[PDB]
Amino acid sequence: AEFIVGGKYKLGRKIGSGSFGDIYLATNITNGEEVAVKLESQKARHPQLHYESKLYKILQGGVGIPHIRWYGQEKDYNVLVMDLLGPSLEDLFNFCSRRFTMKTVLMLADQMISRIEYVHTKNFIHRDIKPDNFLMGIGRHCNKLFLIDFGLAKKYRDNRTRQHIPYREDKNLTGTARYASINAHLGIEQSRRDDMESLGYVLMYFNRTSLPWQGLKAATKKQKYEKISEKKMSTPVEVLCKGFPAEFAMYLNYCRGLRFEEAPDYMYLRQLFRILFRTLNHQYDYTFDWTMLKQKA
Ligand SMILES: Cn1ncc(-c2nc(N[C@H]3CC[C@H]([NH3+])CC3)ncc2F)c1CC1CC1
C-alpha cells in the first residue's frame, strides 16, 4: 500500500498530534496487530525523535510505559512505532461532560503518582504533566493508565552520584501554562517537585471542572503567562480546594513545600488518597465514570 515503515507497518488514518510530530494508526501486515506510529519530518532544524525513542527504551519495564516496536527512517521522515493506546484523560473528561466523581479522581490519582514516580526513579522529569498526556490502555490494559510524550523530558540528576542539575533561573516555561508549577512560571529550573505540583493542578482541574486562572487574556504570550502566574500565586490553596476533602489541599501544600533536591514521598501521597478513598467506602474495581456510561449505552 501507499505508506509502509520498517518493511511491515501500513499507516492508516491520522489519530492526532504530539509534542514534536504527528501520530497515525497502523497495522502490522505480517500478524494483523494494530499499532501507533509517530512521524517526525527529517527536515527539522532540531530533530528529537531519536531522543524520545532513547527515553522510551530507558523506561521499558515500567507499568504503563508503552513498548517500542521500531525506530528508523522512511522516505523523508524519522519514524517511531509503539503500542496503540486508548483515549486520553481529557477525551474521557469530555465524554463524561467535564465532570468526574470523587471515586474516579482518587482511582486515577493512585496510578498518576506511580507513573510519575517511575520516570523519576530513572532520573528523568517529564515537564509536561497534563490530562492529554495520560492515556488509558486497550484490551486487557483498558484500566491501566499510561504516561506518554517524553519530548520535553529532561535528566534531573547523575546516575552515580545523584547530584542534581544546577539550581538556576531564567528558564523558559517549556510545558503547558495551565498546569505549570509556580516556580516554573518564575523561570526556576524544574525538578521532581514540579511534576508533582502539576499533577495537583490536574487533580483540582478534574474536581472543580476548571481552574481560576483559565479564560485569561493579554497582549502577548509572555503577558498571558505572567497573568496565569500571578493568579496562581494570589490564590491560596485552601481557596482553590474549598469544598473538597482536606487531602487535596494537603497534597498541594506538601508539593510546594518540597525543596529543589528533595525526593517526594510517593508512598505517603498515595496513602493520603487511599485512606480517603476507603473512608468513602470505595473499592478499586476500575468502575470509572466512563465505565458507567459505556455499559448503560
Ligand atoms: C501525543 N501522543 N503521543 C503518543 C500518543 C499515542 N496515542 C495513542 N492512541 C491515541 C488514540 C487517539 C486518542 N485521542 C489519544 C490516544 N497510542 C499510542 C501513542 F503513543 C499520543 C496521543 C495522540 C493524540 C496524539
UniProtKB/Swiss-Prot annotation:
- Give the location in the cell: Cytoplasm; Cytoplasm, Cytoskeleton, Microtubule organizing center, Centrosome; Chromosome, Centromere, Kinetochore; Nucleus speckle
Q: What is this enzyme's catalytic activity, as reactions? A: L-seryl-[protein] + ATP = O-phospho-L-seryl-[protein] + ADP + H(+); L-threonyl-[protein] + ATP = O-phospho-L-threonyl-[protein] + ADP + H(+)
How is this chain modified after translation? Phosphorylated by MTOR in response to mitogenic stimulation, leading to its activation.
Q: Where does ATP bind?
A: 15-23, 38
* Predominant location category: cytoplasm
SUPFAM superfamilies on file = Protein kinase-like (PK-like)
> What's the EC number here?
2.7.11.1
Its Gene Ontology cellular component terms are:
beta-catenin destruction complex; centrosome; ciliary basal body; cilium; cytoplasm; cytosol; kinetochore; membrane
Question: Per its UniProt record, what PROSITE patterns does this chain match?
Answer: PROTEIN_KINASE_ATP, PROTEIN_KINASE_DOM, PROTEIN_KINASE_ST
Could you tell me which InterPro entries the record lists for this protein? Answer: CK1_Ser-Thr_kinase (IPR050235), Kinase-like_dom_sf (IPR011009), Prot_kinase_dom (IPR000719), Protein_kinase_ATP_BS (IPR017441), Ser/Thr_kinase_AS (IPR008271)
- Please tell me whether the keyword Transferase is annotated for this protein: yes
- Sorted UniProt keywords: Acetylation, ATP-binding, Cell cycle, Cell division, Cell projection, Centromere, Chromosome, Cytoplasm, Cytoskeleton, Kinase, Kinetochore, Mitosis, Nucleotide-binding, Nucleus, Phosphoprotein, Serine/threonine-protein kinase, Transferase, Wnt signaling pathway
Effect on the protein of changing residue 133 to A: Catalytically inactive. No effect on interaction with FAM83 family members
| A Pfam family assignment | Pkinase
Classify the source by domain of life. Answer: Eukaryota
Give GO terms: molecular function aspect only.
ATP binding; protein kinase activity; protein serine kinase activity; protein serine/threonine kinase activity
Q: Which GO terms describe its biological process?
A: cell division; cell surface receptor signaling pathway; cellular response to nutrient; Golgi organization; intermediate filament cytoskeleton organization; negative regulation of canonical Wnt signaling pathway; negative regulation of NLRP3 inflammasome complex assembly; positive regulation of proteasomal ubiquitin-dependent protein catabolic process
Membrane-spanning regions, if any? none
Q: How is this protein organized at the quaternary level?
A: Interacts with the Axin complex. Interacts with TUT1, leading to TUT1 phosphorylation. Interacts with FAM83A, FAM83B, FAM83C, FAM83D, FAM83E, FAM83F, FAM83G and FAM83H (via DUF1669). Interaction with FAM83H recruits CSNK1A1 to keratin filaments.
Function summary: Casein kinases are operationally defined by their preferential utilization of acidic proteins such as caseins as substrates. It can phosphorylate a large number of proteins. Participates in Wnt signaling. Phosphorylates CTNNB1 at 'Ser-45'. May phosphorylate PER1 and PER2. May play a role in segregating chromosomes during mitosis. May play a role in keratin cytoskeleton disassembly and thereby, it may regulate epithelial cell migration. Acts as a positive regulator of mTORC1 and mTORC2 signaling in response to nutrients by mediating phosphorylation of DEPTOR inhibitor.
The family assignment reads:
Belongs to the protein kinase superfamily. CK1 Ser/Thr protein kinase family. Casein kinase I subfamily.
Its recorded name reads Casein kinase I isoform alpha
Q: Which gene encodes it?
A: CSNK1A1
